[PDB]
Amino acid sequence: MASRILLNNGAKMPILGLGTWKSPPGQVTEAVKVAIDVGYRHIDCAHVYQNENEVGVAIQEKLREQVVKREELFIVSKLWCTYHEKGLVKGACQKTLSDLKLDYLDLYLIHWPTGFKPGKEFFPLDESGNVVPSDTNILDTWAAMEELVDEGLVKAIGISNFNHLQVEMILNKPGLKYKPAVNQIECHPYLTQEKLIQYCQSKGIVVTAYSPLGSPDRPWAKPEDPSLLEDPRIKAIAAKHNKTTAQVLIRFPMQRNLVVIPKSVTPERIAENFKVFDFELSSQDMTTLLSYNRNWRVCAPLSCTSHKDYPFHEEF
Numbered sequence: 001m002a003s004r005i006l007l008n009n010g011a012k013m014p015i016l017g018l019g020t021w022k023s024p025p026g027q028v029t030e031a032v033k034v035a036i037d038v039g040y041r042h043i044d045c046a047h048v049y050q051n052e053n054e055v056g057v058a059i060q061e062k063l064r065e066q067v068v069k070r071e072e073l074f075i076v077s078k079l080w081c082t083y084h085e086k087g088l089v090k091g092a093c094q095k096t097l098s099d100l101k102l103d104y105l106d107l108y109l110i111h112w113p114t115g116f117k118p119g120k121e122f123f124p125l126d127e128s129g130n131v132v133p134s135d136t137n138i139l140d141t142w143a144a145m146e147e148l149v150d151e152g153l154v155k156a157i158g159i160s161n162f163n164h165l166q167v168e169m170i171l172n173k174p175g176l177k178y179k180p181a182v183n184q185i186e187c188h189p190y191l192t193q194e195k196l197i198q199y200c201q202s203k204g205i206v207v208t209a210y211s212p213l214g215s216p217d218r219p220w221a222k223p224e225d226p227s228l229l230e231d232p233r234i235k236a237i238a239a240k241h242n243k244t245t246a247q248v249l250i251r252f253p254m255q256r257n258l259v260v261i262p263k264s265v266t267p268e269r270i271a272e273n274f275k276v277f278d279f280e281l282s283s284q285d286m287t288t289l290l291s292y293n294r295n296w297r298v299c300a301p302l303s304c305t306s307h308k309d310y311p312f313h314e315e316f
């Protein structure tokens with residue numbers, strides 16, 4: 001396996017990065033420091049996570065320390081839904097850059113296809129709990145993203161949580177200047193995404209798998225929910241390979257030509273999750289893991305399900 005995948009902007013992206021959603025601000029600086037020390041070169045960030053300043057402290061220290069060069073890092077962040085307004089995109093990007101202590105991002109993603117009313121609240125609601133949309137056409141948001149490339153703020157742009165008709169709309173945008181480099185979507189053995197991934201790869205868009213361990217720390221977890229990490233069938237595949245179940249869950253998307261971004265704030269697990277470049281799942285193992293699909297989707301925000309661009313009503 002190569003450690004990096006070539007994007008349609010000509011840059012190479014590490015196929016393993018560190019996720020940072022839910023990483024507490026008093027733990028994420030150490031987590032990212034440890035991650036860089038143990039070989040991670042890709043960090044997945046977002047303004048909505050409320051921890052970019054602390055991620056940035058870690059990145060900056062490792063750069064200052066000359067543990068790594070900036071060109072060796074691949075830092076990803078995202079444009080939140082309340083900033084889809086072509087006069088807010090640049091400022092949102094710049095705030096992320098300032099917090100991360102960077103002068104460019106390697107990749108900046110539209111976090112969701114759904115624009116929300118601008119303001120202080122990340123999920124502005126009406127009195128019945130429905131998110132308040134913005135009217136901004138996503139094609140217009142895409143044009144705003146393209147400007148960020150042309151201004152030097154970001155090396156690549158992409159999308160997240162876009163369904164295939166939404167990807168297609170971007171690809172069919174009149175006057176499209178830059179194709180999306182990446183679509184970042186939920187993907188794991190219970191939500192295998194075969195249809196959406198084949199579509200994206202056919203267009204040359206790299207897919208990043210989020211929540212690859214099934215997000216056991218998701219705030220809405222229930223004790224009765226499915227558990228990838230506890231699935232005896234996955235544990236058996238892991239045992240056959242002398243690996244952990246997490247290592248199998250990370251290697252799985254890698255062998256589908258995906259990028260994968262497991263989150264941890266536990267130093268031992270950070271180091272564990274990186275030890276996935278020295279074994280191979282067989283094709284039979286891969287097909288077996290794929291067979292576990294159930295369309296079990298953990299990120300599906302109820303408040304957004306009436307938004308006209310909500311992505312998950314479409315089959316894929």
Ligand SMILES: NC(=O)c1ccc[n+]([C@@H]2O[C@H](COP(=O)([O-])OP(=O)(O)OC[C@H]3O[C@@H](n4cnc5c(N)ncnc54)[C@H](OP(=O)(O)O)[C@@H]3O)[C@@H](O)[C@H]2O)c1
Pocket residue numbers: 018019020021022044045111160161184185209210211212213214215216217229244246247261262263264265266269270272273299
């Ligand atoms: N684009 C989007 O809309 C979107 C949505 C969701 C996620 N994401 C991105 O994808 C990242 C990963 O997804 P996620 O955070 O939802 O969940 P995840 O990576 O599937 O799971 C994280 C959980 O697994 C635990 N864990 C990590 N390694 C483990 C191991 N070796 N053994 C046992 N447990 C382990 C972590 O615990 P500890 O931290 O306590 O070690 C944490 O509770 C996010 O952090 C974010 O960067 C993006």
Ligand SMILES: NC(=O)[C@@H]1C[C@]2(NC(=O)NC2=O)c2cc(F)ccc2O1
Pocket residue numbers: 021048049050111298299300301
């Ligand atoms: N419910 C959902 O699906 C999303 C998931 C999500 N996680 C993530 O990384 N991107 C998201 O948008 C998230 C993150 C937040 F900081 C706050 C809410 C939130 O909800």
Ligand SMILES: [Cl-]
Pocket residue numbers: 046047048049078079080081111
């Ligand atoms: Cl964001």
